[PDB]
Symmetry: C3
Subunit: 183 residues, 3 copies
């Protein structure tokens, strides 16, 4: 129960533009009050698989959202599929879907839901990853905690780039970050 | 201090003094993962000289420092910029009710990061990161964290915030950054 | 056995271009399914000790390799010397070489060895460190998992820079990252 993850294989588990067009590899490891997170993305098909901004000047970003209920269970309207998001067992998952993962949720006092109170930037982490592992192909991964509506907690990953990439496949290096846990 | 968390609490009540009393909330979370401490930090400035940055009217205002000084037992000293009242081991979204007396396992390692001396000062006692003001991607600032370089204490963690862009009336409140350091014990 | 490391003093323990020309400080802490890593480097002598790209325009990168066998034991072709890598015991290392550390190896499903199949970028993490701690002296540390031959697992650090440095001592700030563990 110390690690929630997508499993480390490369089987598509995420829908960005079309069904199962990407494998989001996400590992959440609970280190007490902080969750240590490691993430990467491989797009395998669809609109975001091969980026060509000469042809499509406007395709410059996309978002992957993980929505969770009060028990920390993933809601089906998340881009990530519920099928293989579970507690780890070896290189796979436990046989049964979990019913509670509140200790992996982002803290609501640190990262409040939208309200009419002042919105602070501490609920965002910025990182840079590299497409195809090439140092001159950076893309920004912006992670935001608890800013989606229709859920009790949320983790969203926005990927964007500013260079005019020509036939660059969207598959990334890995990024680590952490966040304060709800409990 | 097996896997405990030493923190500032996650609320937004000012707990730090940069230029004037209680002008900011430093949110700092230190979690012990054996020989390394996993740290998560962000800063909200609410008043004073560093609250709203205008480098067109004040081009020389480009950096400031927040210092956490600790004694031989890992206890935070009162002359640190961070206040002592809400820096303690975590209990729910708050702190345990007794001030801690020992936290040596959360201190930066003295062999990895020696106190100042006339021996060579190696760069490994610094970690650099970039955070963003207001969560805007076009508003970077550098957070430089240095271990054990202050005097008047046994251990120290110093945060230096600086920026090179010429900001015009930009509120200094930041995104979060994670780093780790080698623990003393 | 929760931390494998190099002792964080300044005694040389690594051979880049000549014997014991550097001190790699590496700490690997097992946080369950993820290893939390912290690395820095001091070059004390030889070719990479003082960088002068006016004198040597093409000296712009070097690599430090850690190669491990099936039991997670460091192999002698690694740049890091075997006498310097062991589980922590206070501020030093245990007195006898360890026999197993498979739980510290980079996961082979997440990071496969080279083969005929498509190679994904998720087996790389990029970071930037700073020479002499100066903010205007960045160098890239690229860390790759399980891409070397002659071993069962590997962690390799490639240090490179794009600026023309003139008489700059190669000793760095520290970088943290994590990776998915084998067991
Ligand atoms: C710690 C850090 O982030 N260092 C940066 C560094 C500093 O921001 C700068 O030296 C502070 O004055 O900048 C580096 O890039 C320089 C580069 O920055 C671009 O944004 C700008 O468009 C260029 O004109 C040029 O200034 C540097 O090498 O000094 C990068 C380094 O990582
Ligand atoms: C992994 C990394 O930090 N990548 C950098 C990248 C590399 O440092 C560089 O390409 C060598 O591999 O540099 C990036 O920035 C570039 C500058 O170094 C260069 O001076 O100017 C470029 C544009 O003219 C560019 O800005 C890059 O290639 O995009 C930034 C990237 O994070
Ligand atoms: C979150 C992050 O990486 N932010 C970058 C920022 C963004 O990449 C960019 O604003 C998105 O469009 O870019 C910064 O640097 C800019 C350069 O990428 C650009 O080519 O030139 C700009 C000046 O005209 C600027 O230098 C930025 O906006 O400051 C750097 C920042 O870290
Ligand atoms: Zn593809
Ligand atoms: Zn304000
Ligand atoms: Zn010398």
């Amino acid at each position: 129960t110390r690690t929630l993850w997508t499993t480390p294989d490369t089987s598509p588990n995420c829908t960005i533009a079309q069904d199962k067009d990407s494998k989001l590899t996400l590992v959440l490891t609970k280190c007490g009050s902080q969750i240590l997170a490691n993430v990467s993305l491989i797009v395998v098909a669809g609109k975001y698989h091969i980026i060509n901004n000469k042809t499509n000047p406007k395709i410059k970003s996309f978002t992957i959202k993980l929505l969770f209920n009060k028990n920390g269970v993933l809601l089906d309207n998340s881009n990530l599929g519920k099928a293989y998001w579970n507690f780890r067992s070896g290189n796979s998952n436990v046989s049964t879907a979990y019913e509670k993962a509140i200790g992996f949720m982002p803290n609501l006092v640190a990262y409040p839901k939208p309200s009419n109170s002042k919105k602070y930037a501490r609920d965002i982490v910025y990182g840079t990853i590299y497409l195809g592992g090439k140092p001159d192909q950076p893309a920004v991964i912006k992670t935001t905690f608890n800013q989606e509506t229709g859920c009790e907690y949320s983790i969203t990953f926005n990927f964007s780039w500013s260079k005019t990439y020509e036939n660059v496949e969207f598959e990334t290096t890995s990024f680590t970050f952490s966040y304060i846990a709800q409990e």
